[PDB]
Amino acid sequence: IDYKDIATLKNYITESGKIVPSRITGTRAKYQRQLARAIKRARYLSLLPYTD
Amino acid sequence: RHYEIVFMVHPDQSEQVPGMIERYTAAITGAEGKIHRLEDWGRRQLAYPINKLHKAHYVLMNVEAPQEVIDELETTFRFNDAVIRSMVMRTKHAVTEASP
Amino acid sequence: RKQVSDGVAHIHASFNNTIVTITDRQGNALGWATAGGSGFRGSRKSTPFAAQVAAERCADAVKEYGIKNLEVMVKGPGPGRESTIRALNAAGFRITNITDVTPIPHXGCRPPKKRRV
Amino acid sequence: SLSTEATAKIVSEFGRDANDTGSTEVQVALLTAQINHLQGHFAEHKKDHHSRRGLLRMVSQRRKLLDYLKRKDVARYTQLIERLGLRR
Amino acid sequence: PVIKVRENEPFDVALRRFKRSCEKAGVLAEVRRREFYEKPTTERKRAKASAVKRHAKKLARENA
Amino acid sequence: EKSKSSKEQKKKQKVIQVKEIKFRPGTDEGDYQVKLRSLIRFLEEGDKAKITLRFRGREMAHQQIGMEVLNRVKDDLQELAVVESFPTKIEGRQMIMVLAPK
RNA sequence: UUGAGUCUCGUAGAGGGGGGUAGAAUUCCAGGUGUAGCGGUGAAAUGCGUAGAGAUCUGGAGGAAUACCGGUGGCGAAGGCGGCCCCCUGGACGAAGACUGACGCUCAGGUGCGAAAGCGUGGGGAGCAAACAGGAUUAGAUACCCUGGUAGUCCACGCCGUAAACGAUGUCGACUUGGAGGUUGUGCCGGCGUGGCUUCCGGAGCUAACGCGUUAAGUCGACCGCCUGGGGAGUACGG
Ligand SMILES: NC(=O)OC[C@@H](O)C[C@H](NC(=O)[C@H]1NCCC[C@H]1O)C(=O)N[C@@H](Cc1c[nH]cn1)C(=O)N[C@H](C(=O)O)[C@H](O)c1c[nH]c(Cl)n1
Ligand SMILES: [K+]
Ligand SMILES: [K+]
Ligand SMILES: [K+]
Ligand SMILES: [K+]
Ligand SMILES: [Mg+2]
Ligand SMILES: [Mg+2]
Ligand SMILES: [Mg+2]
Ligand SMILES: [Mg+2]
Ligand SMILES: [Mg+2]
Ligand SMILES: [Mg+2]
Ligand SMILES: [Mg+2]
Ligand SMILES: [Mg+2]
Ligand SMILES: [Mg+2]
Ligand SMILES: [Mg+2]
Ligand SMILES: [Mg+2]
Numbered sequence: 001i002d003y004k005d006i007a008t009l010k011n012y013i014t015e016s017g018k019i020v021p022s023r024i025t026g027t028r029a030k031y032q033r034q035l036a037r038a039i040k041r042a043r044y045l046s047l048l049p050y051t052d
Numbered sequence: 053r054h055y056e057i058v059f060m061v062h063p064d065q066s067e068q069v070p071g072m073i074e075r076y077t078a079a080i081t082g083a084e085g086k087i088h089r090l091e092d093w094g095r096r097q098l099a100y101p102i103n104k105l106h107k108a109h110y111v112l113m114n115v116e117a118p119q120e121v122i123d124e125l126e127t128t129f130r131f132n133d134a135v136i137r138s139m140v141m142r143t144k145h146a147v148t149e150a151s152p
Numbered sequence: 153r154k155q156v157s158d159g160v161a162h163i164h165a166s167f168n169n170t171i172v173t174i175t176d177r178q179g180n181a182l183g184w185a186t187a188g189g190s191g192f193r194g195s196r197k198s199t200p201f202a203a204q205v206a207a208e209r210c211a212d213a214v215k216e217y218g219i220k221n222l223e224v225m226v227k228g229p230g231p232g233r234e235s236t237i238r239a240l241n242a243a244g245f246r247i248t249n250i251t252d253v254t255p256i257p258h259x260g261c262r263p264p265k266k267r268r269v
Numbered sequence: 270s271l272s273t274e275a276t277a278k279i280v281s282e283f284g285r286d287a288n289d290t291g292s293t294e295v296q297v298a299l300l301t302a303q304i305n306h307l308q309g310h311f312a313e314h315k316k317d318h319h320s321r322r323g324l325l326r327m328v329s330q331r332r333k334l335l336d337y338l339k340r341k342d343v344a345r346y347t348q349l350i351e352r353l354g355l356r357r
Numbered sequence: 358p359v360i361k362v363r364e365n366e367p368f369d370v371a372l373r374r375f376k377r378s379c380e381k382a383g384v385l386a387e388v389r390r391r392e393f394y395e396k397p398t399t400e401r402k403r404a405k406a407s408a409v410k411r412h413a414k415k416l417a418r419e420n421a
Numbered sequence: 422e423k424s425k426s427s428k429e430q431k432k433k434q435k436v437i438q439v440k441e442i443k444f445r446p447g448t449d450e451g452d453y454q455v456k457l458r459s460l461i462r463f464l465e466e467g468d469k470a471k472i473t474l475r476f477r478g479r480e481m482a483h484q485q486i487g488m489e490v491l492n493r494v495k496d497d498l499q500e501l502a503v504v505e506s507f508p509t510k511i512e513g514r515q516m517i518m519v520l521a522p523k
Numbered sequence: 524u525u526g527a528g529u530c531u532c533g534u535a536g537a538g539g540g541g542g543g544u545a546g547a548a549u550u551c552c553a554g555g556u557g558u559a560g561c562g563g564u565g566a567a568a569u570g571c572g573u574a575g576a577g578a579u580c581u582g583g584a585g586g587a588a589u590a591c592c593g594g595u596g597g598c599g600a601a602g603g604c605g606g607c608c609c610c611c612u613g614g615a616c617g618a619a620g621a622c623u624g625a626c627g628c629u630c631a632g633g634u635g636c637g638a639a640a641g642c643g644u645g646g647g648g649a650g651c652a653a654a655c656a657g658g659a660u661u662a663g664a665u666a667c668c669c670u671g672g673u674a675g676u677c678c679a680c681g682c683c684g685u686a687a688a689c690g691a692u693g694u695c696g697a698c699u700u701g702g703a704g705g706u707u708g709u710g711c712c713g714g715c716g717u718g719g720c721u722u723c724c725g726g727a728g729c730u731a732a733c734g735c736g737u738u739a740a741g742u743c744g745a746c747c748g749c750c751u752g753g754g755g756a757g758u759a760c761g762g
């Protein structure tokens with residue numbers, strides 16, 4: 001997973017900008033952890049939004 | 053030891069970015085700098101406002117360097133009042149391939 | 153006085169009370185009305201109906217500004233969330249965007265202790 | 270931990286060969302190298318109790334290896350501690 | 358939960374979409390849990406009993 | 422109107438409530454002293470005290486035991502209190518002396 | 524050389540210490556707009572507001588904590604550990620080898636670590652809140668409820684050394700039917716294996732029973748700790 005890959009990451013965030021559970025998306029636990037890191041890094045750089 | 057440096061510049065200061073990108077790479081290539089990737093992403097739309105700015109000039113650099121010179125580069129970004137944000141990361145390997 | 157074409161309806165819907173406030177688009181207050189000021193007192197305030205009345209009186213306060221469009225900005229878990237906006241639309245404002253504010257801390261401050269009741 | 274180059278130096282010095290990583294001399298030399306290296310760490314980071322538990326394990330493992338070498342071969346023991354500059 | 362009323366939509370339909378947007382996003386449940394302080398032991402205990410219940414229902418779904 | 426405030430300041434006048442300590446024909450020194458303390462406080466803090474003794478079943482046949490308790494209270498709370506009311510008859514099963522701040 | 528270590532390569536992880544930093548939220552301050560309520564409860568009142576509150580919007584200040592991810596998920600000897608980033612650092616595990624050659628296991632005394640409260644000194648102090656102040660309730664109300672609120676909670680350094688510090692189950696090793704999951708390696712050709720950690724059920728066996736059941740409370744061995752009716756008492760005395 002990559003923090004720069006906004007297209008893929010946007011599939012695993014909601015409209016509000018919240019990370020979706022692995023039970024919903026069917027992601028494996030290892031990748032779900034990488035995904036969560038990537039999204040938070042993207043949030044820091046203002047590539048993704050935190051809220052709203 | 054394989055870093056990845058993103059930094060975002062004040063969008064009005066997109067003209068300064070030419071001179072700064074030189075200085076950073078010149079310092080890194082001074083001491084066994086391996087500029088694996090360098091991508092001027094350009095003035096992108098921010099997902100939220102940073103300092104009442106809705107745009108900023110993004111830059112990416114994947115470099116191998118001394119762990120001292122990167123800390124010395126991080127010191128400059130703080131002092132650079134134009135540059136608004138930066139994430140220095142550690143990569144395990146070199147990244148040569150292009151990002152979107 | 154000034155005329156305003158489009159307004160914003162801020163609905164502070166607490167558990168105990170509803171405050172409806174119509175502002176300009178830049179959040180300048182035009183008129184306000186509460187369930188507590190609508191001839192409801194105590195826990196009478198904390199009903200959907202008392203909020204409905206508060207909405208209507210708020211609409212009546214901002215008749216002079218000549219508003220037809222409102223953007224709704226509901227906030228809180230109050231019983232009068234939906235009853236306000238229903239009654240706002242009944243006043244004859246065209247409701248554009250309908251939107252949930254509701255401040256959520258991303259952790260934030262330690263809340264008060266649980267009531268032992 | 271020590272670097273791969275730092276390890277490879279010690280194995281060549283204190284070993285009978287580069288292949289000989291097992292010998293008590295190498296082991297004690299490796300443990301000594303890391304123990305001495307971490308003295309700077311715990312000087313700054315006094316409250317790092319979790320890491321210090323790892324250091325005490327190194328010291329305890331060195332002691333046990335030295336005690337083994339003493340009763341196995343005093344000549345090897347005496348040479349080793351003087352090289353590394355260990356009191357005992 | 359931001360709900361722009363789209364090109365020619367009724368209010369009652371639009372209100373159903375707004376309420377559902379809030380329901381999915383988790384706003385009323387979130388405010389209520391943040392109303393009073395829950396100390397970590399209570400949090401952990403609550404999380405365990407849920408996990409026991411969830412799992413035990415699967416063993417009731419099985420054996421049947 | 423904030424007029425109200427006037428009352429808030431008016432309401433900084435005062436108020437006396439009567440507080441009711443119930444004694445029983447055979448309460449013991451310990452608890453007497455606890456309840457006696459309660460009254461001292463009640464009274465010193467500007468309040469009245471409906472002191473009630475509450476005969477139960479046959480105890481109503483030795484009312485004179487009761488009266489002695491009341492008379493002890495009167496005689497202890499002497500310098501703090503004046504005795505609005507004393508009882509003589511035992512209406513119901515009760516004897517309801519009311520003391521007030523001296 | 525089979526126990527125990529070392530080396531090579533790789534993997535996962537809220538393991539630890541230090542520094543920086545992001546967004547949300549509460550409070551406060553300064554303004555703008557605005558007008559009579561706000562807040563609170565079982566019901567009220569205290570409280571706050573026309574010296575303009577609450578609400579709404581803009582900006583600023585400061586402290587504390589990190590929503591979602593988040594999982595009978597992970598890591599750690601235990602206590603415990605959760606934004607992101609860097610620096611320093613400990614352990615675990617797998618694959619093939621190569622190496623040392625019993626270097627081992629346990630451990631009275633000893634030494635260190637050890638939640639929260641607490642203590643000393645100096646900072647800090649948003650929110651929360653023992654004590655306390657006022658408002659209620661009541662037969663009373665030294666409470667539960669309401670409005671405030673100090674220590675403290677936070678940081679540094681030192682001290683304290685206790686918790687239902689619990690799996691109420693000491694550590695190490697060997698052996699003994701199964702089933703369904705989770706998490707993390709790895710080989711081979713989604714499938715077929717094979718390691719580590721972990722959740723639930725259950726067989727023999729064990730158990731007073733409840734239950735435990737290859738992560739044993741089964742079958743054995745090594746070493747340590749501890750118990751010997753209840754209360755008196757984890758108290759007195761002494762160290
Ligand atoms: N005071 C005395 O000596 O006797 C009176 C006492 O017995 C009253 C009784 N009180 C209660 O149960 C407490 N429960 C805990 C919260 C506080 C309090 O409420 C009670 O009946 N409550 C009522 C409210 C009330 C107080 N005085 C007169 N009425 C009540 O509604 N209690 C609730 C219940 O019984 O379930 C509940 O406890 C509650 C909700 N809100 C509050 Cl306050 N209490
Ligand atoms: K800067
Ligand atoms: K020993
Ligand atoms: K305080
Ligand atoms: K039985
Ligand atoms: Mg752990
Ligand atoms: Mg614990
Ligand atoms: Mg042992
Ligand atoms: Mg503490
Ligand atoms: Mg102190
Ligand atoms: Mg408080
Ligand atoms: Mg309180
Ligand atoms: Mg104990
Ligand atoms: Mg025990
Ligand atoms: Mg079982
Ligand atoms: Mg047994």
Ligand SMILES: [Mg+2]
Pocket residue numbers: none
């Ligand atoms: Mg004692």
